[PDB]
Amino acid sequence: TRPANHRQLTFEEIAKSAKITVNEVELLVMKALSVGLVKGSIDEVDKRVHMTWVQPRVLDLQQIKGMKDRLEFWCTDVKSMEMLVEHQAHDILT
């Protein structure tokens, strides 16, 4: 659910969401890390879990539309930078 910029889950968040005690949260992450469901690391000093990868899941049509909008923004960025490089280096472009 969380965007890639905010995939740092506090121990309290996992404990509350999973209906488990805080001291067990780490062990839960261990299983999810061992099976391969998720990827990341655990910072037990700050009681946080840095999650970097998720098992891909079945998406709804609306989620696919949002993904296509993300692709629209990505295509706009790629095209803009391609035109920038073509314009700036036009004289030396082969």
CA–CA gap between residue 50 and residue 12 (Å, rounded): 14
Check residue 33 for interaction with another protein (CB under 8 A): yes
Q: Is 12 in the site for another protein (CB under 8 A)?
A: no
In whole angstroms, the minimum distance from the beta carbon of 69 to another protein comes to 9
Distance CA 50, CA 41 (A): 5
First to last CA, the chain: 46
- Any contact of residue 28 with another protein (CB under 8 A)? no
- Applying CB under 8 A, which of residues 11, 20, 31, 38 lies at the interface with another protein? 31
Query: How far apart, in whole angstroms, are the C-alpha atoms of residue 28 and residue 7?
Result: 17
Check residue 46 for interaction with another protein (CB under 8 A).
yes
Q: With binding defined as CB under 8 A, does residue 67 bind another protein?
A: yes
CA distance 71 to 65: 10
Cα–Cα distances in Å, from 37 out to 23, 28, 41?
21, 11, 13
The contact set with another protein (CB under 8 A) reads 4-5, 27, 29-31, 33-34, 41-46, 50, 52-54, 56-59, 61, 64-65, 67-68, 70-72, 74-75, 77-79, 81-82, 85-86, 89, 92-94
